[model samples]
Target: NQALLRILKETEFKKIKVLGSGAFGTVYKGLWIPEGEKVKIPVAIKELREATSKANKEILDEAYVMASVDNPHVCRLLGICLTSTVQLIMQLMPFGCLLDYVREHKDNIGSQYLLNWCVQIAKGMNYLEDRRLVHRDLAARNVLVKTPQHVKITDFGVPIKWMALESILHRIYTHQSDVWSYGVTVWELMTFGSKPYDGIPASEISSILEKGERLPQPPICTIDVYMIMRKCWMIDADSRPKFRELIIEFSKMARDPQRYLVIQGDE
Candidate 1:
C-alpha cells in the first residue's frame, strides 16, 4: 500500500470549491503544494463522507487500482490524505465532465472534435485493458473533458451500474463489459448526452438487454459510427472488439477529416 500511495496530512492541500457531490463522497477543486516546492498544482480531491471501515477499504481499493496504471488519457491519482475525511488527490479537469460538455457544445462542435474525444477515450480504455483492469462503469458521465478535444476517464472509485448484459446476469465484469459500456458511451456522444436506453427504467434493463435489444442509432449518427456502437453491444462478449482495436479504428477516423465530413453529411 505504501508503495502505491504517498500519504499526506489534510493541510497539505487547500480546497477551492466543491466540484461535485455523490453518494460515496464529494469532489473538490484543490491546490497542492509539494514539500519544498513553491509551485502549487491544481487537483481534484475526493473526500469520503465517512471514515467507516467499508469506506476505507473502498477508497484503498480504488487508489491501488489507479496507482497500478498510468496513462495520459486516464485521470492520474496524485496521492492521498488520510484524515478525519479520507481524501484522494486527482488530476484536475478544467472543463468538467464529458456529458455536460457535450450537452453544452454538441450543436456547435465539429465532427472532428467529437471524433478526437472518442479516440482519446478508446486510448484510455486500451491502456486499462493492457493492465488487465476492467472499468466496469464506462460512460460519458464518467469521462472528464480537459479541453475541446481532450478527455480522460474518471470515477473509477464509484460503484458500477453501467453493467454489460453478462454482468447483469452473472455479476461478471471483464474488459469486454467495458467495451459494451463504451458502445453506450458512443451513443451518448452521438446523441449529445442522451441517457442510455432512453425511457427504459433500471429494473427493465436486464430483460431488455437479454432480448438482444440495444439502443437505436442516434438521429444524427452515421452508419459507420453506428456500426462501431453495435459491435459493442454484441450478446456474446467475446464477439466485441477489444479496446486496442477500437483505438486503431478511432485513430483512423480522427486522422481522416474526409471521413468525418462524410459522416456529418448523414446527420
Candidate 2:
C-alpha cells in the first residue's frame, strides 16, 4: 500500500448494477465522471467490505494490489473513492466475468477469439510475475471480459479447484502456484467453464493431485493449448512454465495459430 493511490469522489459515480460480490467486495457496473474528463465513463466500482473498527488491511490490500497493476490486460485501478467507506473504481468490462462470458458465448466465439483471450491473459500474468506479484487468486472467475475477443485478469482471489498442491496444503503462494492456477484457467477457457476434476470429491483432490493425477485435457481443445496447461500443473511446482515463457509461446501461437490450433486431441 506504499504507492500513491489516486482518489475519486463518490458523488461523481453512479452505481448501475451488481457485477459480482465476494469476500473481497461487492462490485457494481457503474458510470463515473473523471475530474476534468467530459464524458461519464463506464466503470466497475468495488465497495470494500466493512471493518469493525477501521481494521482495513484487506481493503487496503485490494486497492494496493489493483493500483500496482498497470498493464492493459489486467484490470486498471481507475482510482478509489472515500465516501462513507471506501470504493475502488475500476475499468468495466461490459460483457461480464470470463467464466460466464465463455459459457454463454463460446458457441458464437471463433477459436481465434478464444486464443486471443488466452494470450492476453498470459501477457498480463507475465507482467505481474516479473514484478514478483503472485496473484494468489488466478482463475477464470477472476478474469473479466474486455472486448468480445479480449479479457483482463481481475479480482485477485481463488479456489481449491485452482490451487497448486503446495498452495492448498502449505499455504505457499508464488509464481509457480499462480502458474498452477493459470493452467486451470486455460482449461476453463477451452471447456467453456466446465468444472475441473468432475466427479472427484474435494476431500480427494489433494491426494489425487499429489499422485500426479490432473484434469484430463478438455475433449475439444487444441493439443498444443492443452499441453501448455499441462505444463503448468507439474507436480514439482518449480517445474511449471514461467509466465515469460508463456507469453512467448502464446504470442507465437497467436501469430502462427494454424500450427497451434490444428491439434484437437478429441472431438
Candidate 3:
C-alpha cells in the first residue's frame, strides 16, 4: 500500500534509514504516529526484492502466515502494500534480536537469565507448534526481543509442513526440521550470541550434522536445558517434543524461577 510512505509525508509516519538487509529484502526503522498526537511509536518496514516468481511466492506466503497468526510472541503485521513488489510493515522492535543483546551483555547474561529467555522462546515455539506450524527459520537473526521483555518470531519465509511420502523420501522441509534449527538457536542464546559451530569449518559442521552429530555443548548449559536440546536435535525427526509439551515444560520453568539459579562453576 505504501500508505505508510504517504502518511510519513503527511505527519503520522516518519521515514528512517534502512535497518538491515538480506537476500530477500531490506528492513527500515520508522516512527509511528497516531492521529493528532505528538508522541511517536517505533515501527519497521520490510520491502521485499523484486525477483523470480518463487521469491515472490515465498514473500507472499510469509505475509499471509503472519496475518493469520495472532500471538504475543509473533510480530504483528500492521499492514502491507504492493506495487511491483511487496512491502510488509510490522511492529518495530528497538532492542533487535537476542544475538545483539547477548553480544552487548555477555558478562551479565548468566545461565539463570539465559534459562528465562529460553523459556520465553519456548513459549513462543509452543504456541506455533500447538497450531501445527513450524518456524522454518529459528535463528538469532529471525528472533526479535524488545524492552520490558517481549519477544516476537519473524522471517517466516518457508512453508510449514509435515513429513510426507514425497517429503520423507525427498528430504522435504517440515515442522520437525524446525526443531533441529531450534536446538542451534538455543545454543546461540546460551553462549551469548556465539556463532554456530565456532572454530569448526562450515563444511565440517554440515558433515557432522549429516553424520548424526549434534552441536557441541555450551560451557554453561544445564543438564535439563541440554536434555531439552538433545530432544529437539534428535536425528530421528519423529522423536522431538511437540510445541505443546515444550510450552508445558517451559511454563513450569518460568514459574519455578529458582530452578534457574546458577553460581560460578555450579550450574
Candidate 4:
C-alpha cells in the first residue's frame, strides 16, 4: 500500500527550533497547520540535505516506505513537504529519545512499563522484519518514549558498537543484524541508559564478541530478560530469534512480571 504523501506548500509549516541533525537531515520541532485548520499541531520535521541523485533516491524510497508503516510502536511519518527542501513531517514524542528518557527518569520508572517497552519494540521490529525492512540503525537513540506505556522506534540512526560481529567485519546486514541491535537497546532499557561496551574500545569490541563475550547483565536486569538479549546476540544471525519470536518471549514475561522481572540483589 502507498503511504499518503503530502506535497505541502512551504507556507504551511512554521519552523520553531532545531531538535537534532543527522547527515541526512536536520530534524526540527515545529508547528504544522494542516490544510484549512487554523489550529497548530506540534510535530518533528526532518529537512533533507541536498545530495547525489542516486543517494537521494535511496532516501526518498526509504522515506516513502517507512511512511506507510502502521504500527503504534513505530514512529509514523505524518506527511512530507517537497516544495523546496524535502522535509519529512513526523510524530513528536514528549520525552524525546529513549536514552534521554531513561537517564532522566531512571529511579522513577516502573518494571511493568519497562517490560512493556521491551515487548512493544519487538512488535515494531516484527512488523519491519515481516516487511523485509532492515533497520540498519536500530538503537536506543533511534527510539522515542512518548510516555511510560507508549514508545516508538524512529530514525536518525546508526552505530558500530551496536553491530553484530558479522556485520562489524563482513559488512552484511539483514533481519539478524537488526535483532542484534535490538538486544543492545534492550540492555539500555534494563540499565537505564548506561553506555554499551563502555570499557571496550571500538576496534576491540569485535574481538570481544568474537570470543563470545557480551554486555554484562545490568544491575537491575533479570535472567529471563537476559536470556532474550543472549538469543539476540547469537553469533550466527540465523541462530537469533526473529522479532516475532522475541514478542513471544516478552509477552510471556509481560503476563507474569514477578516471575521474570524480580530484581536481584547483586549489581
Pick by lDDT: which candidate is best? Answer: 4
Tens-digit per-residue lDDT, 96-179, candidate 1: 999999899866867777788888999999998888778888899999988777789987742233678788878889999999
| Candidate no. 3 TM-score | 0.79
Query: Which pairs of residues collide in candidate 2?
Result: 137-157
Q: Candidate 3: how large is its RMSD?
A: 5.0
Candidate 2 Cα misplacement greater than 4 A, ranges: 1-4, 35-37, 53-65, 262-267
- lDDT of each residue in 78-168, candidate 4, tens digit only: 7776644678887678778888888998878767777898899999998888778888988889888787688888873237889998898
Best candidate, TM-score = 4
Candidate 2's residue-wise lDDT over 157-259, tens digit each? 2378889998889899998899999989988887888988887777789998878788887755667888899999987887889888888888777776666
Candidate 4 — which residues are off by over 4 angstroms? 1-3, 22-24, 52-60, 156-158, 264-267
TM-score for candidate 1: 0.90
After TM-score superposition, what is the CA distance of residue 188 in candidate 2 from its true location, in Å? 0.6
RMSD of 4: 2.6
**Colliding pairs, model 4:** none
The superposed Cα distance between candidate 4 and the true structure at residue 237, in angstroms, equals: 1.1
Q: Rank the candidates by lDDT, best first.
A: 4, 1, 2, 3
Candidate 3 C-alpha lDDT tens digits along 136-236: 67776678977626777787743211112222345555677766677777778777788765566543454565576676677666577678877876666
